[PDB]
Every structure is written in structure tokens, then in C-alpha cells.
């Protein structure tokens, strides 16, 4: 009779395996994580798939309601810097190309996440992580 078991997770479009914590929290909810990977692929049809936190709510009986969020920055820099995945030793090697330029767009389209609840502050957090991910944030 589950009194509120609203449970989120970490699942990209197209990866349906209802094992714990989907089992002991959403298995006792009977929520459709199968319908997740199916219909979540619809609202997110930009590349078909992307890492995004789900969230399914149960309501005194069995009502369902799923909610979603955003992809990881280690992909926002990746497929926009020419850094295909990794770089090794993110400080010594400067491979990519995200300078002072396209970082404006990359940091732009992501708003309801990060930490600073604005875009004029943790853009240096952005400007540093690109280094942490082995990319040259060369001056412009």
C-alpha cells in the first residue's frame, strides 16, 4: 500500500534493467522502466539517447508519474571540442579546441543544474573542468 515511494535514478534512453534500486523501491511500485526507455526516447530524440536522472512516484495505491533531468558535462565538452573521449593526464596534453569561444554556448544550453543558479559565476568552474577533461581552453 506504499505511502510515497517516489524514486529517481541514473538511466539514459535505452537501457532497461529493473534491478535494484529499481527492484526494492520501484519494483514495489510496479512502475514501467520499460516504458521509460521507450517513451523517454521520444521526448529526447536529439541523439535518441542521453544520460538523464529519472524519477517515478507511487501514490497511496499505485499511481505513476515519471520525471527527468540533464546529461553530463563530460559530453557537452566532448562532442564539441574534438576530444573524442579521453586525453590522458589532463594537464600536460592540450588536444581539443574549446577555447574562450564555444564555451559560451556549451555553458548556455545547460541552466537548471550546475551549482551557481546563474550563468556568470561557475562558468569558471566550466572553464576549469575542460582542463580536467584534458582539453585546451586556449585564450581567445
Amino acid at each position: 500500500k506504499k505511502v510515497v515511494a517516489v524514486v529517481k535514478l541514473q538511466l539514459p534512453a535505452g537501457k532497461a534493467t529493473p534491478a535494484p534500486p529499481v527492484g526494492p523501491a520501484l519494483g514495489q511500485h510496479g512502475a514501467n522502466i520499460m516504458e521509460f526507455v521507450k517513451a523517454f526516447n521520444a521526448a529526447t530524440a536529439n541523439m535518441g539517447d542521453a544520460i538523464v536522472p529519472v524519477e517515478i512516484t507511487i501514490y497511496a495505491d499505485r499511481s505513476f508519474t515519471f520525471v527527468t533531468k540533464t546529461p553530463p558535462a563530460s559530453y557537452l565538452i566532448r562532442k564539441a571540442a574534438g576530444l573524442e573521449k579521453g586525453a590522458h593526464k589532463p594537464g600536460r596534453e592540450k588536444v581539443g579546441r574549446i577555447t574562450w569561444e564555444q564555451v559560451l554556448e556549451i555553458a548556455k544550453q545547460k541552466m537548471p543544474d550546475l551549482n551557481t543558479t546563474d550563468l556568470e559565476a561557475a562558468a569558471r568552474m566550466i572553464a576549469g573542468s575542460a582542463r580536467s577533461m584534458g582539453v585546451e581552453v586556449v585564450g581567445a
Binding site: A60, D61, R62, S63, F64, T65
Partner: protein, 51 residues
């Protein structure tokens, strides 16, 4: 038709008190959760609680 499908507690456990029928429930919404609106109250059933 409601107790052997939606109500998990079999047919005699959720309605244990079928000695004097004392059980109500079943959520609903607007737009999405219209599966529990009229398809559980349209199939010759009768739970007049909300919608």
C-alpha cells in the same frame, strides 16, 4: 474485476471485510493518468470517489 487485477491483496484479503464491504481508493489525474479514470469506472463498475 478490480480485486483480482489492481488490488494486490488477492480477492479475499483486500476485501477481507466483505462481511460489510468497507474499502475505497484508486488514484487518478488529468491528461496522463486517465487510465484509472474511465476504464475502471466505465467497464460496468462503480467507484464514485472523484473521477
Amino acid at each position: 474485476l478490480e480485486v483480482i487485477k489492481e488490488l494486490r491483496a488477492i480477492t479475499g484479503l483486500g476485501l477481507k471485510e466483505a462481511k460489510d464491504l468497507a474499502e475505497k481508493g484508486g488514484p487518478v489525474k488529468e491528461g496522463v493518468s486517465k487510465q484509472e479514470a474511465e476504464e475502471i469506472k466505465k467497464k460496468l463498475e462503480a467507484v464514485g470517489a472523484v473521477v
